[PDB]
Amino acid sequence: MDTTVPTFSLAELQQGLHQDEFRRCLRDKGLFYLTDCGLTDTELKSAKDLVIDFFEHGSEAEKRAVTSPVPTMRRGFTGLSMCYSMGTADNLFPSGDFERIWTQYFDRQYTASRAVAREVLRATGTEPDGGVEAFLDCEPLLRFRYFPQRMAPHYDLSMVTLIQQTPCANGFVSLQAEVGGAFTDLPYRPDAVLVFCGAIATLVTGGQVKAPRHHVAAPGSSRTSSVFFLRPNADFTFSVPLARECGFDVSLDGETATFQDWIGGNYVNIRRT
Amino acid sequence: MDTTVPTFSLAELQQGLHQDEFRRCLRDKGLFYLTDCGLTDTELKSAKDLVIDFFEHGSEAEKRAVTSPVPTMRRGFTGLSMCYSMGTADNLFPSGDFERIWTQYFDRQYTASRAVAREVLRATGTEPDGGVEAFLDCEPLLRFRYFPQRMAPHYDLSMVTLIQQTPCANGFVSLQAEVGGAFTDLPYRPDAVLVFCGAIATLVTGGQVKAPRHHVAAPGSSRTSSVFFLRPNADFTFSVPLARECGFDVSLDGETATFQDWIGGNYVNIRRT
Amino acid sequence: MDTTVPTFSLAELQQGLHQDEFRRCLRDKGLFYLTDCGLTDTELKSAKDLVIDFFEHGSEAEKRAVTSPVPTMRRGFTGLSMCYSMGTADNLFPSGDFERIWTQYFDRQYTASRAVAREVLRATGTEPDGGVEAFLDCEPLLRFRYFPQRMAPHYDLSMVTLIQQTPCANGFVSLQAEVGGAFTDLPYRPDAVLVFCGAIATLVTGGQVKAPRHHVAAPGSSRTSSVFFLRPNADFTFSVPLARECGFDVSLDGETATFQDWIGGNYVNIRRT
Ligand SMILES: O=CC(=O)CCC(=O)O
Ligand SMILES: O=CC(=O)CCC(=O)O
Ligand SMILES: O=CC(=O)CCC(=O)O
Ligand SMILES: [Fe+3]
Ligand SMILES: [Fe+3]
Numbered sequence: 001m002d003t004t005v006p007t008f009s010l011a012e013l014q015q016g017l018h019q020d021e022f023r024r025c026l027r028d029k030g031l032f033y034l035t036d037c038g039l040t041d042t043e044l045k046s047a048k049d050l051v052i053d054f055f056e057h058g059s060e061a062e063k064r065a066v067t068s069p070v071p072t073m074r075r076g077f078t079g080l081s082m083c084y085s086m087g088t089a090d091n092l093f094p095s096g097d098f099e100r101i102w103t104q105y106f107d108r109q110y111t112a113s114r115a116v117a118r119e120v121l122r123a124t125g126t127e128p129d130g131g132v133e134a135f136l137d138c139e140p141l142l143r144f145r146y147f148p149q150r151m152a153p154h155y156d157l158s159m160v161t162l163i164q165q166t167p168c169a170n171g172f173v174s175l176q177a178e179v180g181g182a183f184t185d186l187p188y189r190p191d192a193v194l195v196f197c198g199a200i201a202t203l204v205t206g207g208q209v210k211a212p213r214h215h216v217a218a219p220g221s222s223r224t225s226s227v228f229f230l231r232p233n234a235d236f237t238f239s240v241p242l243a244r245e246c247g248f249d250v251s252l253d254g255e256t257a258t259f260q261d262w263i264g265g266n267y268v269n270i271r272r273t
Numbered sequence: 274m275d276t277t278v279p280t281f282s283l284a285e286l287q288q289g290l291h292q293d294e295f296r297r298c299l300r301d302k303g304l305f306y307l308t309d310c311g312l313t314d315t316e317l318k319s320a321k322d323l324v325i326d327f328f329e330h331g332s333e334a335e336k337r338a339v340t341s342p343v344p345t346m347r348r349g350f351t352g353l354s355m356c357y358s359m360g361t362a363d364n365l366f367p368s369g370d371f372e373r374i375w376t377q378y379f380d381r382q383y384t385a386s387r388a389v390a391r392e393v394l395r396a397t398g399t400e401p402d403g404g405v406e407a408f409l410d411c412e413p414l415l416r417f418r419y420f421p422q423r424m425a426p427h428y429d430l431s432m433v434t435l436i437q438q439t440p441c442a443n444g445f446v447s448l449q450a451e452v453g454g455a456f457t458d459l460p461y462r463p464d465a466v467l468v469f470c471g472a473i474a475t476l477v478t479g480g481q482v483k484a485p486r487h488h489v490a491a492p493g494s495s496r497t498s499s500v501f502f503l504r505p506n507a508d509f510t511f512s513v514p515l516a517r518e519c520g521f522d523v524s525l526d527g528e529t530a531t532f533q534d535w536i537g538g539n540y541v542n543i544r545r546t
Numbered sequence: 547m548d549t550t551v552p553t554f555s556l557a558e559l560q561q562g563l564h565q566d567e568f569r570r571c572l573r574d575k576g577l578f579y580l581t582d583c584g585l586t587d588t589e590l591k592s593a594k595d596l597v598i599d600f601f602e603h604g605s606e607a608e609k610r611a612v613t614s615p616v617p618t619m620r621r622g623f624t625g626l627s628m629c630y631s632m633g634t635a636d637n638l639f640p641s642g643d644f645e646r647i648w649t650q651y652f653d654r655q656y657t658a659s660r661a662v663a664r665e666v667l668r669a670t671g672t673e674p675d676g677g678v679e680a681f682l683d684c685e686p687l688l689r690f691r692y693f694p695q696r697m698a699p700h701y702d703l704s705m706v707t708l709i710q711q712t713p714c715a716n717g718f719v720s721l722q723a724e725v726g727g728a729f730t731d732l733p734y735r736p737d738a739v740l741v742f743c744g745a746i747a748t749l750v751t752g753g754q755v756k757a758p759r760h761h762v763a764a765p766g767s768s769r770t771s772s773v774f775f776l777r778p779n780a781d782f783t784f785s786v787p788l789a790r791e792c793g794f795d796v797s798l799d800g801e802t803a804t805f806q807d808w809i810g811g812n813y814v815n816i817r818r819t
């Protein structure tokens with residue numbers, strides 16, 4: 001009945017500690033807080049401050065200069081509530097300190113994400129087709145969103161998703177996840193990042209990892225979130241019969257398929273039941 | 274102007290009776306009640322009782338044991354309102370009498386579905402590419418849903434869909450379908466199953482069969498439905514120009530395509546206009 | 547800061563006038579009114595009158611005769627609010643003067659659309675793979691919609707979309723587009739058609755053209771719109787790295803891809819952020 005969202009130290013997992021507790025969490029819950037992963041509250045504030053300054057004080061001209069011509073929220077600025085997005089390349093940076101700060105922040109996120117994904121693979125004895133490092137050298141997307149003073153349940157289609165929130169001034173907890181058949185609060189932890197396992201973790205490990213559903217509840221209620229999707233390459237290859245065995249309703253002829261075969265030609269980050 | 278949802282006896286259709294009335298119904302309405310198809314109210318109650326018992330009385334542990342790690346509603350239990358899903362293989366059965374009861378129920382549904390699909394093909398002089406039996410040896414999905422005391426209009430992308438409902442205690446009729454340009458009640462019939470023709474019937478027969486839109490209206494209002502989708506294999510092959518002729522807005526290069534080419538790498542069961 | 551939706555004369559653009567103003571509009575706004583393109587208010591009324599007469603006075607039998615068996619809104623009549631759709635072939639025409647009127651109207655729309663698309667390509671120095679004329683000999687869809695006395699923001703996935711509205715009797719302006727970070731009215735112009743650049747303009751020109759988001763606001767509030775999507779052929783081919791550079795979140799292996807590879811096997815006309 002234990003419906004508590006656990007916390008693991010990345011460093012401790014890397015030492016081979018708590019493997020049973022970790023495997024069990026992955027199987028039964030698919031989400032956890034992660035400490036000791038190089039992701040500090042002080043840095044979150046560094047990056048958050050300068051993007052919030054851009055959101056509030058950037059001109060329409062400065063904003064347009066870092067807005068994509070198609071409004072995909074893949075790179076640069078998106079007005080909706082506002083978002084800033086980046087990946088490993090093709091970024092759009094406002095002038096000044098922004099690029100140095102956000103490149104470093106992105107890098108630390110990407111490293112942490114690969115590192116925890118590596119532990120998810122290790123804990124489940126999983127060797128992706130083509131090898132672990134090729135699998136993790138992938139197609140990440142970071143999105144930073146400001147929400148002024150709400151979201152339908154879905155599960156993520158990432159390998160893993162890392163989430164760093166800033167809290168509502170009034171102390172309301174917006175993010176919730178299904179745990180043990182009940183929606184459970186997922187509050188800000190100045191000391192920890194939240195990790196959701198995505199459908200790709202389920203797929204790659206042959207069903208050893210749960211992709212939990214989550215949502216944001218409606219109620220000083222403004223908040224921001226940094227969401228880092230670790231997304232596989234288009235050519236990530238998996239077994240078709242094995243996908244069917246763990247609940248994927250695939251329409252795929254023959255025995256192996258790629259991520260592109262399954263999802264199509266545009267990334268899809270989330271899915272509803 | 275006759276906007277009445279008709280009923281046909283499967284046995285009678287199999288005898289070659291009412292071919293005109295049947296062809297006309299398929300063309301102009303795309304839905305009908307089906308009697309004499311091996312699907313009894315007593316069996317519906319047998320299967321419904323033991324899954325309702327599981328929904329109400331199963332522990333979170335028992336539920337988790339038959340819940341997929343991705344919440345696709347393909348197999349086993351899904352909490353949302355609750356659902357139980359199954360196909361021809363890879364099933365997740367609660368302990369005891371459940372598996373025997375639900376395997377038999379699934380089988381009778383699958384047989385009825387193939388049998389009526391065979392009559393839809395016969396009535397329209399349709400020989401699917403690769404032959405009738407290969408076409409019908411396919412990828413069915415049964416979903417049983419409990420609705421506590423609502424759904425946007427869509428059409429189904431199945432060949433056919435068979436629906437067995439249990440009624441609201443208060444006698445409200447929830448399911449409705451467009452018939453003759455008007456939404457028409459589709460009440461429980463203890464003696465009959467409701468059949469919707471899906472877009473695949475339209476596609477395979479070269480437009481001889483309508484895929485009607487339907488929805489569920491809001492008002493003792495609780496209800497359950499058993500929905501059996503007869504879905505084609507990924508390699509079902511059809512003519513591209515012929516698909517375009519009957520209203521399919523296909524983006525497909527060249528002259529033939531497969532169901533996977535059209536729909537993509539995950540089954541999609543329903544579509545909105 | 548100039549958030550005004552501009553107007554260009556097609557004839558003048560064809561003369562090579564206003565190239566700077568046109569390039570800038572395409573880059574920063576992605577939409578404009580178009581005059582002198584062979585599309586008269588008198589013709590809009592000719593075609594609108596006879597389809598409105600059909601909507602109001604056509605029998606269910608006449609309507610069924612020009613309704614597709616799948617409710618895709620690709621061709622013929624769709625009851626929802628009502629729609630009439632057509633393309634270059636496979637049309638469904640009510641009896642009488644309708645076909646002559648609507649074929650001529652469609653043709654004038656298609657010509658105007660190709661002509662302005664040709665200018666978008668010229669202004670941006672773009673040579674589509676396979677050449678300009680092959681690219682423009684494509685898969686257009688015209689939809690004419692009556693709205694009785696509302697739509698979420700999206701951008702179009704067309705090359706260009708041409709829109710001819712009829713106004714609300716009461717003078718309410720329903721259609722709005724993001725311009726300079728603000729939603730801007732897009733009123734009826736008896737003398738001009740509205741052109742939205744779509745995501746395919748963005749893609750083909752390597753990011754030189756914006757695909758603006760737009761929506762319809764809620765308030766004599768009835769209105770109609772004629773919407774002509776100029777949509778590429780399934781085999782339209784583009785550079786994968788170049789698509790990524792302009793914000794497309796593609797999951798495509800290797801270096802080139804087709805429109806079908808990206809979008810899948812059914813046209814998708816619109817997308818949300
Ligand atoms: O997929 C994205 C999310 O679940 C966003 C969650 C959040 O708002 O914190
Ligand atoms: O596609 C599924 C349905 O139309 C479900 C209908 C129902 O609720 O009975
Ligand atoms: O994509 C279609 C539209 O944006 C329709 C706009 C309109 O209602 O005028
Ligand atoms: Fe999520
Ligand atoms: Fe349905």
Ligand SMILES: [Fe+3]
Binds near residue numbers: 701702707760816
């Ligand atoms: Fe649009």
